[PDB]
Amino acid sequence: SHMCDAFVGTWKLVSSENFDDYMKEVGVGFATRKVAGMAKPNMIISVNGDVITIKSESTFKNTEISFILGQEFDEVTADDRKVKSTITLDGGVLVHVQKWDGKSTTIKRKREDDKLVVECVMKGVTSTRVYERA
Numbered sequence: 235s236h237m238c239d240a241f242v243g244t245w246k247l248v249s250s251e252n253f254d255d256y257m258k259e260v261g262v263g264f265a266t267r268k269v270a271g272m273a274k275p276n277m278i279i280s281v282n283g284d285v286i287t288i289k290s291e292s293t294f295k296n297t298e299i300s301f302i303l304g305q306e307f308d309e310v311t312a313d314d315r316k317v318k319s320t321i322t323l324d325g326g327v328l329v330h331v332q333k334w335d336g337k338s339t340t341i342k343r344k345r346e347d348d349k350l351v352v353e354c355v356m357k358g359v360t361s362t363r364v365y366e367r368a
């Protein structure tokens with residue numbers, strides 16, 4: 235109970251930095267990078283018992299994942315990578331690791347003031363995306 239309460243709700247993207255380079259590092263192709271980078275998703279985070287659901291909705295794609303913290307799952311990403319994902323809570327930060335083809339990327343979400351800040355890291359490339367409550 236009360237797992238992730240400060241993350242629950244509906245969030246809207248308000249800024250992005252370094253996201254094209256992050257996607258390039260991950261291996262996303264040119265056309266998908268351009269359309270995805272233009273996207274202004276809403277992110278809807280909910281909890282029911284031990285299950286967390288994260289939906290991301292935009293003109294580019296609508297995605298949905300549901301998971302239990304610490305319990306790996308298979309994910310098909312917005313670029314159609316088949317990845318093995320594990321999401322944990324570490325010190326208040328939601329940490330999402332995706333593994334595929336001997337590669338790994340981490341997406342970290344944290345509450346800062348009234349924002350939800352998202353840090354995407356692939357090797358030495360980091361992108362920061364900031365969301366506000368809808």
Ligand SMILES: NC(=O)c1ccc(-n2c(CCC(=O)O)ccc2-c2ccc(F)cc2)cc1
Binds near residue numbers: 274277341
């Ligand atoms: N639904 C959407 O428009 C959408 C927008 C961005 C992503 N996204 C994030 C978002 C992190 C966050 O901001 O929480 C990290 C990596 C991706 C990605 C992966 C592959 C790809 F080809 C395009 C984007 C995923 C869905």
